[PDB]
Amino acid sequence: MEMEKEFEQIDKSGSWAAIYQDIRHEASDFPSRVAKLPKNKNRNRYRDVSPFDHSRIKLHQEDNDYINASLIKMEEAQRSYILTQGPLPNTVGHFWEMVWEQKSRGVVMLNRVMEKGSLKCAQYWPQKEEKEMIFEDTNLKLTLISEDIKSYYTVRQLELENLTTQETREILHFHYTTWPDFGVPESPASFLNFLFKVRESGSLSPEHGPVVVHCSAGIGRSGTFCLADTCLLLMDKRKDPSSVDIKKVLLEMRKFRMGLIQTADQLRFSYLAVIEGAKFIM
């Protein structure tokens, strides 16, 4: 079916929970043996969210190559994404090692450091120009270059230096700061505006390594971001845009990381975002 009328049909029939449960039932199950090794326990935020072995990002290190991160490679859309958890106190150095090694140009953050009175990820970037951060375990230096605070998002320019080689690179930090503590946004307008600011920066383009996107677990809000982006690109590429099937695209992405889209409310919100975005594009 087309999307917008499928949407009204599910609203009128009140069947979002049933639709979402059939996605959960049909989703891929692949092994995640490396994530569950005892030596990696303090590298995982949640025991039930792990990268599959076949798609996990490997650190270029011989002692321990493990990080909770997955490569989502969308063949028809010609887009790739790295989805990861919010960094932990012991994995902030690993996180920036991955950004360096994968040649990424942008980091997309969809949570606040504290939500619901609890810590959702480490403070992993510097807040003042004159107070830079050094990660001694991975030999990287990180400096805040500039910061632009807007009503619904903040963009930061960061400098990452590989202290072994003295090479430097500019990284863009795109921080969506207004997702509510509970539920989903009432309108997709600010989330879509944010997506197109990330696009305009070059951070999603083939000249660069894959964008790194995270929230707390790296599956819910993060899944909404890449699902909306890929569906809108497919609608531009195909002769028949009404042929884009958001449930089929989501099951394709779940071949690469488990659990993407965590609630029926996030599923409905993803439909809303694609429907409303399709109109602005033209």
Side-chain angles (χ1 to χ4, degrees):
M1 206 192 311
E2 175 190 59
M3 204 186 352
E4 171 145 37
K5 291 185 283 154
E6 214 216 324
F7 179 86
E8 296 271 353
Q9 207 249 306
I10 302 169
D11 258 9
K12 75 169 169 50
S13 36
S15 47
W16 282 108
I19 301 300
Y20 178 67
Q21 259 305 139
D22 191 52
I23 288 163
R24 284 185 83 251
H25 178 270
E26 283 302 284
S28 302
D29 191 23
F30 293 113
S32 50
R33 284 167 209 130
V34 180
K36 303 308 280 172
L37 296 174
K39 67 175 174 162
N40 291 323
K41 170 191 223 184
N42 78 343
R43 289 182 185 217
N44 294 310
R45 186 176 284 286
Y46 302 104
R47 319 249 83 71
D48 58 333
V49 181
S50 299
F52 299 140
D53 295 321
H54 80 89
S55 55
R56 75 185 182 93
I57 300 294
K58 297 178 187 184
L59 307 172
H60 300 177
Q61 216 282 285
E62 31 188 335
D63 169 53
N64 190 341
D65 72 6
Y66 178 75
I67 183 168
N68 192 317
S70 307
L71 180 66
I72 307 327
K73 190 167 181 193
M74 301 310 282
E75 171 175 14
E76 185 190 357
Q78 284 294 288
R79 279 270 223 257
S80 297
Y81 317 83
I82 293 168
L83 268 62
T84 193
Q85 71 186 13
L88 292 156
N90 289 293
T91 71
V92 168
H94 306 150
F95 177 88
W96 288 113
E97 176 184 2
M98 170 171 76
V99 170
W100 183 269
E101 288 168 356
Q102 302 300 316
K103 302 179 155 56
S104 308
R105 165 71 162 152
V107 173
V108 172
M109 168 175 184
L110 302 173
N111 65 287
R112 294 166 298 281
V113 166
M114 174 167 282
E115 299 184 4
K116 296 180 183 184
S118 297
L119 294 174
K120 297 297 168 194
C121 79
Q123 182 61 53
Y124 66 86
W125 73 93
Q127 296 177 282
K128 302 197 155 143
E129 286 87 341
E130 69 275 13
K131 295 277 205 192
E132 75 273 13
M133 289 176 90
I134 300 208
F135 305 101
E136 286 186 2
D137 61 339
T138 55
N139 215 31
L140 292 158
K141 177 175 107 172
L142 183 67
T143 308
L144 177 66
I145 298 303
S146 74
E147 180 170 68
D148 191 359
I149 302 172
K150 310 286 208 333
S151 48
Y152 63 110
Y153 81 100
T154 296
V155 194
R156 309 181 178 93
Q157 279 183 135
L158 308 170
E159 185 202 64
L160 188 62
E161 183 180 347
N162 178 350
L163 292 173
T164 300
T165 67
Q166 297 198 144
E167 191 196 333
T168 64
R169 277 177 214 160
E170 179 175 275
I171 310 299
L172 301 180
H173 194 242
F174 283 90
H175 188 182
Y176 188 78
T177 54
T178 54
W179 195 294
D181 275 352
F182 291 96
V184 305
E186 178 176 68
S187 162
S190 57
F191 191 68
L192 286 164
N193 276 317
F194 175 76
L195 168 60
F196 278 93
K197 297 294 187 186
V198 181
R199 277 187 176 195
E200 289 177 5
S201 79
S203 291
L204 291 163
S205 301
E207 292 71 28
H208 301 292
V211 68
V212 172
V213 352
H214 78 88
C215 47
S216 194
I219 62 174
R221 302 174 195 182
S222 290
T224 301
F225 183 88
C226 60
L227 181 59
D229 182 53
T230 283
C231 286
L232 289 167
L233 219 44
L234 293 170
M235 278 169 94
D236 273 347
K237 216 171 202 255
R238 291 190 180 173
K239 289 185 181 184
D240 178 9
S242 75
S243 72
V244 174
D245 185 334
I246 178 168
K247 302 189 258 48
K248 288 174 181 3
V249 177
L250 177 53
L251 287 165
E252 179 66 25
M253 303 177 145
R254 276 193 177 216
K255 298 178 179 173
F256 302 92
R257 188 170 174 83
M258 39 180 76
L260 303 181
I261 309 298
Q262 282 178 293
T263 69
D265 224 4
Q266 281 176 5
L267 184 65
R268 181 182 187 275
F269 180 75
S270 299
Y271 273 75
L272 262 184
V274 175
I275 292 167
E276 294 301 313
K279 311 166 155 158
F280 199 73
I281 201 90
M282 67 85 251

